[PDB]
Structures are given as C-alpha cells and as structure tokens.
Design a protein around this nucleic acid. Sequence first.
RNA 1: GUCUACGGCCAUACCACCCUGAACGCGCCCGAUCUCGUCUGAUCUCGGAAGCUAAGCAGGGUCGGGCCUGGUUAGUACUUGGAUGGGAGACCGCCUGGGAAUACCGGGUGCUGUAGGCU
RNA 2: CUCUCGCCCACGCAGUUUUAUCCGGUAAAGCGAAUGAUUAGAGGUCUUGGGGCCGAAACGAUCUCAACCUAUUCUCAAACUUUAAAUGGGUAAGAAGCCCGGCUCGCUGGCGUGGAGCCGGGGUGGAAUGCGAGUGCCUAGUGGGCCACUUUUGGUAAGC
RNA 3: UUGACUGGGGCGGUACACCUGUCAAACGGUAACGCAGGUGUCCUAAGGCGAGCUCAGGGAGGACAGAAACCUCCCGUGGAGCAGAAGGGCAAAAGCUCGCUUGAUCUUGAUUUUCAGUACGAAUACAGACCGUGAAAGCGGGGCCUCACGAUCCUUCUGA
RNA 4: GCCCGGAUAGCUCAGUCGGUAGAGCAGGGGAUUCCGUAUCCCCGUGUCCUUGGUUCGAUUCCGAGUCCGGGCACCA
Lengths: 157, 169, 61, 208, 294
Amino acid sequence: TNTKGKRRGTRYMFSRPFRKHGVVPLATYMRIYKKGDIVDIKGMGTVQKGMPHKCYHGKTGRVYNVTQHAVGIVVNKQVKGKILAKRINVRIEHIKHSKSRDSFLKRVKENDQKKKEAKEKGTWVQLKRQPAPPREAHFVRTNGKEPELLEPIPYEF
Amino acid sequence: ENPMRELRIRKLCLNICVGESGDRLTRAAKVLEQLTGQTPVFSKARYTVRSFGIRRNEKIAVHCTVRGAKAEEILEKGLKVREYELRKNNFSDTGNFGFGIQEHIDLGIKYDPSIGIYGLDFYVVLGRPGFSIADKKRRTGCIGAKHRISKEEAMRWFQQKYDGIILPG
Amino acid sequence: AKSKNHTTHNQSRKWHRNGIKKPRSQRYESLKGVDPKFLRNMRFAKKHNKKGLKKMQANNA
Amino acid sequence: RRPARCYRYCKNKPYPKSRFCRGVPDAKIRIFDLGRKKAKVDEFPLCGHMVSDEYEQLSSEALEAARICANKYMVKSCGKDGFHIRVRLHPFHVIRINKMLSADRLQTGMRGAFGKPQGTVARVHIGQVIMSIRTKLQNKEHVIEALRRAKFKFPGRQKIHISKKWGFTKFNADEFEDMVAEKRLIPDGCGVKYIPNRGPLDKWRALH
Amino acid sequence: VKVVKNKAYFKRYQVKFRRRREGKTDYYARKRLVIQDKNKYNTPKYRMIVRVTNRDIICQIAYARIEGDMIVCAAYAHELPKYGVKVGLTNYAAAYCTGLLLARRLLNRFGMDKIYEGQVEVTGDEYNVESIDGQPGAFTCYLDAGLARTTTGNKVFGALKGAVDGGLSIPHSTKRFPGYDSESKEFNAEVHRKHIMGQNVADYMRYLMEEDEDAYKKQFSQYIKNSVTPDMMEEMYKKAHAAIRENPVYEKKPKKEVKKKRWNRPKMSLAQKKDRVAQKKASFLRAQERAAES
RNA sequence: GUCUACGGCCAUACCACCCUGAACGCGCCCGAUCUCGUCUGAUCUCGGAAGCUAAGCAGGGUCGGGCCUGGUUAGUACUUGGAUGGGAGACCGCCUGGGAAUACCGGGUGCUGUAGGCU
RNA sequence: CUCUCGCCCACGCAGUUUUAUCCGGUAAAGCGAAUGAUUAGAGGUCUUGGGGCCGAAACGAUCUCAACCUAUUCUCAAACUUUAAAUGGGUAAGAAGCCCGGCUCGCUGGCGUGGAGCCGGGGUGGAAUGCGAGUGCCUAGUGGGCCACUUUUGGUAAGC
RNA sequence: UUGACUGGGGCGGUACACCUGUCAAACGGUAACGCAGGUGUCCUAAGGCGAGCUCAGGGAGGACAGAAACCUCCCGUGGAGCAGAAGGGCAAAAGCUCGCUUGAUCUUGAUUUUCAGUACGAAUACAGACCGUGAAAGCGGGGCCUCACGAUCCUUCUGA
RNA sequence: GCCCGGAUAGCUCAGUCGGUAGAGCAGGGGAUUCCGUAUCCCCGUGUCCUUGGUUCGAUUCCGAGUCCGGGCACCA
Ligand SMILES: [Mg+2]
Ligand SMILES: [Mg+2]
Ligand SMILES: [Mg+2]
Ligand SMILES: [Mg+2]
Ligand SMILES: [Mg+2]
Ligand SMILES: [Mg+2]
Ligand SMILES: [Mg+2]
Ligand SMILES: [Mg+2]
C-alpha cells in the first residue's frame, strides 16, 4: 500500500529551511558532547551519511556513546502500546544541545548558593518556585480625565 | 592626467572553423602555426546538429591566443589587408573588437595547393594594468565601473594609435 | 467476500487500558554498544586500581 | 452534460489543469473584458459589483451566459462603448465524470471509479465578487438592471453592491480626484499606478 | 528591452560566507583540517598557517575554538632583518628561516628547547623528528597551504622544513620539496640544500653580472643598495640560522608614542539625511519656478 | 581611528552607481635564470621593487533595490472545546479559550575572537 | 510475590495543567516573492512579420498591428511556496542531584593534557493537582464489526 | 492437480515483493481495483582519492556563418548536470576535465529501518587487519540519499 | 450508443523531411496526323477540418472542439 521506505515522508523535513543552503557552519562540529549530555535530533539534508530516520526528527535523547564522527543517543520511541528505550548512532551534524535542562541548571546553581545565604543571614526565603498567582488587589487611577465611551460600529459592507 | 591606466593589447585570439575534421582541418593548423610560431589547439563540437555534417566531440576547429609583443605584430598584418578601416559595429559593449580576414595568404603566408585557403578571425581583447584580479585564483574581484573600458573608449584608442578609420555607415 | 482493511479504531483505548509505561530508567545502564577501544581501556583501568593503589591511597585519604 | 446540481457545492480539494490532469476540455468563457477596454480611469467613475452570498461552484459555462446577458443589455441603453464589463473569477477547478456504460452492467460496477475530466468550474467564496461593470455616474440605474438580469443564470444567491471605490481601482472615490491631482497617483490606461514617497529622488525630478 | 535580467534575484539570493566572498578560504578543506575526532573531547588540533604575500611571508600556529581561532605564536619575515637577512624577504631561504624562527619560538614558550633541537646542520635531506622517552612529547602539527597550488618547489614547503628542523613533528612527504625529479623518483637532497641557502638567486645574480649589468641594476637593485653579493649570500643565511636558534623570544616595541583619533568619515544621522532630501526638493523647485518664469 | 594574518555568527555583512583613502600593511605592478605549469609566464609557480592608489580593498553617500526589525492589516482570516443554536440545504452566528499573512507605513544597515603593525 | 503508608516528609507514578525549551509545513495567506497556470490595458523601443506615402532606388524620411521589455492589474494550485497558526509531539522540573580531595588507564597525547573509571568527604524543603506501587507465571475468548459529532477519499448521490 | 485479490464470479488488471510525490487532517502511524509514475537494471568507472575548472542561459562582437557549428568578453543562486521514476541534496561542489589506483578486499560483534519488536534485504557507527590516494589533515571497506532482490533440503566451488 | 484512424484542388490520394502542398481521373490549351482515335506536354484548382500551444519556422508536432466512417458485446 504505502511503500515502507527509509526516508519516505520527508519531502520538507530533511531539507535545509530557506536561504540557509550551501555548506554547513563549522561550529556545528566544534561542540563537545560528553556522556549524559541531553541532545535533541534535527536531521539535516546535506550530509547523507548519518541521518537517523523520520521518527527521531524533533525528539530528544541522551548521549551514551561518543566516537569520531557520531554519537550514540538513547531515545524513547512510541510504538503501539509501549515505549521503547532505543539507541541510535547519529552523525554530529544532525544534533544540537538541548537547552531544555539549561534553565534548570541555573536554578540549581543559584539555588544551592542562595540556600546558604539564608544560613548566614537567618531567614526563610522560600526558594521553591510557585505558579502565577491570582492578581493582587491593586488600585487604578483615572486622574484628570474620565473614561472613554465606546460603542459598536454599524454594519456596512 | 590619468597615469598607469592605459589601453594595451591584452590578448589576440585567432581561429579557423572548418565544417569537419580529418585532412582539411589538419593543414589548417599548419596555416595557423606559421602565423604565430606556437602550436594550435583543437576545438571540437558538443552539438550534433545533423545538417552541418557535424558530430559531437568531432574536432571542428583550431585556435590560439597571442600575447605581448607578438600580438601587436600579427595584428598589424591583419590591419593592412583590411587597410586600417573598420565599422562602428565591430566594437563590442565591452570594448574589445575583431575583424576577420579571407585568403590567409594576404597576411604573410605563401600559397600551397596541397594546403588550401582558409579565412581567419582576428579578435583583439583590450586591457589595462589591473584586469588580472578578475582571473586571479585567490582574491577574485570585479573590476569597477570607472576602470572597465567601453565601446567609445576603444574606438578613440584605435584612432589614436594605428591612425585607423571608424567608417560610421 | 470483501472485508474491512485497516483501522486503528479501539486500539488507542486498549493501549491506555494498562497505561503505557516509561522504560524504567534504572541507575547503571549496561555497557552494550560502547565502542571497543574505549571499553578495552576502561577495564584495564579497573583491573589495576584494586591491585596497586590502596596503600598510597588510604594515607592521602 | 449533467445538470449543475451535480456540480455545485465545493466538495473535492481543488483539481486544476496541470501535468497530472492532461485530459480537460476548454472553458466556454475565453474573453473576460467586453466593454470599451481602452478607457482611462476618469472616463468611468463608478462601478457596481455582484457579490456571492454562499460558498459554491459556478461553472465556466454559466459565466458565459451571464456576461452575454449583460453585454447584450448594456448596448441597448448605455450604448456600445459606454461601459466596461469585467468578469473577475476564472474557472480553474476541473470536475470529473464517471462515464459508465461506455444499457449494460458490462463495463464495470464501481470498480475503477476515478473519472475523466468533464468541465471547468470556479470555486467562489462568501463575499467574493463575480462580475463587475463600470460606467458613467449618469448610468447608475442601468448598472443594477444589467446585474439583475445576469443573476438569474447563476445558482444560489448573489447581492448587487454599488462600491465605494473609483472604478476598478482600490482607492476610494471621494478623495480620488483630491489625490490623483497633486502627485500621488498617475493614470496608466484603465488602472492607477500609486507612487510612494520612498523611491529614488530622480523619478520625483522626472515628475513635476 | 533585451531581457528580464534580475530584479527579484536579490529576493532569493543566498550569500556564501563573509570569508568566502572575500576570497580567502574555501571551507571544504577547513572542514577536514580543523575539527577534532570528538572522542578526544577537548584536545586542540594545531595547524600551521603559512601565507605568502607580496613582500612578506606569514607563519602561524593556530587551533580553533567555537568563538574564533586562537593563535599560539606567530613569526613574520619583516621581523627577519633583525637577525641578518635584510633583503629578499620572499625567497625560499627566507621561508626556511621564518619557519625555523616559528619552530624555535614555540618550543621556547613550552619549555622544550634543550630537548628537541631538530636538525642543526642544514642538509636538505628528509629529517623526521620523534619523541624521546621520558620528556614531554613532540609538538605535532599539520600544515595547510590554504588556497595555494602545492606544486613542487612551492615556497610554502620552505616553511615546512624550517618547522621540521626546529623540532616540530609534522606529517609530510619529500615529494614537494624542490630537488625532486618528476619523471624520476629520487629526491636530490643536494639540490634542496642548495635551494634552501639561496644560491640559485645568487647564480641568477652571477648570470646578470657577466651577461648584462644593465638588467642587474633594474632587478636586484636593493641588493646593491646596502651590500649584497652572491658569494656573501650562502653564509648570510647560515649566520642567520645560528642567530634565530639562540634568541627567538620576540621582544615587542612598547607601542604607545601617540594619542590622536580622526581619519575617516562618521555615518550621518537620520535628521541630517532626511533634511538633505528637502534641501534638494527646495533647490529643484527654485530652478523650476524662477528659472522657467524668467 | 583603522589595517593584516587567521576566524566565529553567515546579507543589518549583499547588489548597482558615486566620492574620499594620512601612515604601515594588503594589492596593482616589473621580469622567466633556476622550481613549476601552460596553445599562450594571462592563470599557476618562481626572481624582483622603477612606479601607482587607476582598480581591488577599506570608510562614506543614495527620499536606492534587497535584507533585518517593528507598526498597520487585525482581534481580522482561521482554530480548541460546547449547545435539543439558525437555515430546505450550502453555510452561518454565539459561548469558551488561543490567534496569523501580504499590500501599506516607519526605523536600521555588520557585530566581535586570538595574534601582529601603523596612528 | 516484592515492598510502601499504620502514629518539621511520601519511594514512586500519571490519556492533566504550569514553567521553560525544542520540533513540525496543515488551516489560513501569498504570488507587484521562485516553480506552474492566467486576464487586461499603459509606456518604451533594437527589430523582424506585415502594411501607409514622399520614390527609378537608397537601415535618406514619416505612422499602424505585433513581438520584446518595463511598471502595474484581474484570478488560482492534493502532488507550488517566502511567511505561517489553533490543536499537537519530545525533553527537563534534584540526593542516581551538586561540590571538593585523591588515584588507576595498555585510551587520548606540548603539558600534573583530555576523558573515562574507582575511592573518600561535604551540604536534602526544590511547579500545581491526584493517587499505593513494582514484578513474574499461567492463560481463555477474539481475529465478519457497526453508528454518530468533527476531519476527509472515490462517487451525480446513497440507509454506498 | 487446475493460485489469490476482486463493489457476485468470469474476462481484464496487479492494488500479490519493492521505490518517489500525494492522499494524510503541520511528530510518527493511517485505507480503497484512490491519483501521478517507476523497479527485476546499468557501471573497472558511472567505484576510491587528489587537483584544476564552472553550469543552463542571455547579451554584445567575430571570414563564410544563417534561429543552430567555433572563437572572445560580459552578466549569470544552480534557472544545468549528477545512468535512470520522483523528491531531497550539491558551486574553488556531490557537477566538468585530468592523474594515480582497486576499500566493489579480509574479520568479529553492536545498532537502525520492516517489526512480533522475528528473518532476509538495505543501512549506520565502530573495532581489528591489509591497502589505495593526498604535501598532509583526512577520505575510502561500492554507486549523493531514498528502490534494485531470496530460507531449510540438495548441488557446486573455495579454506585450514 | 461506448471506442480507432482520418478531415486536403472539380474529385480522389500519397507523402505535409519541424523547411514544397506533389501523383492521377474530369475540364482548358497545344502538339501530333491525310483526318481522327488513343497519345504526349503544358496551364488551371488547395482556410492542407476550426482554435491554441511548442523554434528568422507547424496544415505538418502536442491536445481541445466539431465531423466522418470503422467497434469492446459473459453466466444468469
Ligand atoms: Mg619556461
Ligand atoms: Mg618547465
Ligand atoms: Mg607576470
Ligand atoms: Mg585603491
Ligand atoms: Mg579610488
Ligand atoms: Mg555604505
Ligand atoms: Mg532601501
Ligand atoms: Mg470547535
């Protein structure tokens, strides 16, 4: 029916976006991937040698293996009724650093040190984050003028 | 007033286009060597058109480039058989020109029946000190609008030297 | 004798009937798939640290 | 040719004449402007549109009978070369025919059911103009009656709307003469070429 | 009237790179010569940038970071008059003496001078340095000519053996040093020890004495200027190779000497160019009104 | 205040035309005896240093064209969920939450890394 | 069966939201942006195709249709697209975490470099809401389906 | 003994193994005898590396020479080519020309794709030999990528 | 009432190589012979079916309409 081919539904997603064709920027290769670095997968279209599949494009995994030109990444794949820890070799052009934990890594760094500021100063700063609370009972001011009377416009085509 | 910006002969390029290869194209190289003193190189086709008798990669022509002091000395041979007159539309928009001749023995060559008679196409390109940057390998640049040479600026050059005739008909 | 070809109908509610589960990431994943020249060094490093270290280690510890 | 009840309401995704279709006949409309096409902008100030009320398909063949019905009427009172009719929507949607029995069950059943191209229709949206004429301001009542006779050849519902613009342009007719006068608009035939104040200053010297 | 030329070509145009449009690099070979096998994780791959110009040759050792290259040491040839070679700063023997200045200066920084002294006597033969057991290892490095055509006798390889003879480990072949017969296979090291001391530009001086001393004054005029003669030249480099191996430290002039700041135009502001427009719009209408009413 | 060598981000850096360029540099340039390469010392390679900023290059300019950024367009077009809502239908309105795109208008026009020199 | 709650904090998990962070090319929109279609006039002229004359003849001289170009304008696209939603998809939201000290390596290699591993030491309250989880064995029936919102394919339509 | 699928069966066709665009409702998955096509090959170079070069096109010129030969200059973001069906990719290139070559070799596992998470096929990242190329970094264990193929039993050849 | 090739002088017909509309029957005019038969030669006669597209080039290629003939034909 449906031609179960590798690289099948990627008429658009294995393409360079627009006016970013040509040869690749070189700081793509001067990235440092250690074990446990959380990386996400976005397969390009210029390098043919190590593009993953159309199931990992847009997903995020974690580096378990580092070699000369590629990186082993352990991702989760939704197959029918269970998800599977799967491990793929992907060349280094197709990935980047996930910034999803990098806004967690600030608030473990500036949270551990602000904890020990309350031990020298003596308070209960409550360093845990809260959601957006309901708005405070504030006070609006119509100083000078009076409010504007608006009304719905008539219908004209 | 305008120092080291002058029109000099950059290269002169000659060819004979025969409709075929074999014997007739081979002694056309014998003609073109005795004009210059250097070996011709063999052009060939890439459009089999089947009405000119032509075929792809069939050696269809011979040509050469002449530079420097030998370029002005073969050019003066071509300009006296043409009698130092040209037309206004022998001058391209890029300034370079060419005129072409028939009966190659009207140029300095003696005749041979076993060779035959060919017609040349002298085409002269013009240049200044500084056109090397557009063909240089490393830092390739374009030439600038005020430094490129024009159709009118070449026909005042062909008049100045060679006391030539533009003949504007 | 023509029949119905392919559905995914009813299949999503019986996937979540037992509630699809994360693979249960357990501390100390195995060393399968690790490249061998890195791995062949790392057990050279393991078979010598217990042997020739712990007299000049405890004193600095 | 089947009735237009069959080929009405926009059901299929649009299927134009391309290298994938390759078997489509010609539309019965081939000319689209039929008044005096050569006129300038100030020669016909007002215009009057007819505007669709519903989202349907109008056939290429119905647009023929409508513009003939309006060009015939407006040479009768507004006269020949005193108007400029323009039919605005163009037929690009190719309808298909499952041409069966080509009295027998013998060809197929519904087996190979994708049909052959049979005509062209124009998909029209709610609020999209179909026809548009422009005349003198003295001939305003003939605009409505020409569009009134034309709407009996279309399915569905259409309303006739006298516009707020100057002719077939996009600028309002109240301040058109106020603003073509000084510099901002130049007339080029039957249209208006808006000139901004942000080009090279040389064309502003070419103006004035 | 002729064609359709471009007009929306700028709407879709995709520039190459700022360093490719300037014409310096290629990025095809830089992609293969700059980036590390990333199971080495941090260790820099060192290059040897050798750039000839008009009147100068530039030797640099660099490694690449994400924010730009870092250059560990640089050695020039307009420096080289301080050691004795006062003229002819682009020949093959200046290139051998610039790379040897580049090789000694790097090893002076890392503390590796008393070890890894390279090849003291200059024989032109294929020397190749190894790593002595117990000491720090040899500085390994990779050459790139950049955008030069590496035929044999290209003077980028003069800077390649000056680096080798100072103690830098560089993978190379002797196939491109001048003194390699192409249709043969041998490498004449006697020619390459002649080509490295500048005797072939000395023989071309001797060829211009005894034939035509007029051309010997047009070319080679600044050899004659101070004192340069083709018998002095072979010791002149050997007295310069002695001097760079004992003082490569590159002291610096203390740079201050002046405080002045104005040389080119500033970018004019919005109100200055918006009022330039109506100043032209006024000057146009004064010659449209007055100069056509008169 | 700039340049050179090597770079990063890859048009706010491009393209066309036009003005200016102290000093070092980069170039144009001048030559083929060797190295090398050609139909052709044009290219490439090699020896120079009499000239010249003419070009490239660098700064600036253009009611510039692109590009970048923001207004309008527009709470519009679409859309999540809802109704024993309307209508013969086609479709529409409301509730609940999100929410664009062009024409048109304006403002911008390379930023910096390491090493080295002029000023 | 392994355990967890029995009486200033849940081990854990979730068809949920939030907080960030990625991913995507559908609706829409666009074509005075590429590809492909497409209507109309205007302006300009190298021209040929063809006419109008001064005329033995002269790209000597004077107009028209066209073509070409330039700036606009009407209308579109399941297999077109610069731009681009709503719904959606992944990851992260701590003790398996963070920091420090040392030592093994035959890997890497200017370098007490780099990276892995091992040992030891220091500080646990780290979005909202809900909930007890984890795990193995044995295993029957089933393998003709049907309808309705909304989304869509073939068809004139269908209780197709 | 007399294949199956099949808007009854037959006739027809291959929707029976595989590939591209779409359908497909912006992750993936997704049907019909739905749409538009392709496959059972071809290649000692069309494989491998290195170097140099730039394409389609258009303009203006040049003996014959004209819409079409060749020569030269200019512009030229891919409008060409990459064996072929499409889509993606590609400019000191993956194209064009040239110079050497056989990595289209030897061997063990891991992984991805189809998936039951089996196999073949195809693919990816290595590791260990032995090589080729290049000044070298490097690249190469077939074709720029997505297709181009086949169990047990038996036969045959090769290997210590 | 579905499909395959054709639409051309007075007719009829082939070729309309992507570059002319040419055999032949009917009429015209000659020549021929003592005069006629036959003959032989020359002249006439082409929207090359209608429109649109593809190159100093299309009747000719491509496919739209119209027409003309020639045809796929189950068990029940
Ligand atoms: Mg020579
Ligand atoms: Mg030679
Ligand atoms: Mg020269
Ligand atoms: Mg200059
Ligand atoms: Mg200047
Ligand atoms: Mg500027
Ligand atoms: Mg602008
Ligand atoms: Mg809803």
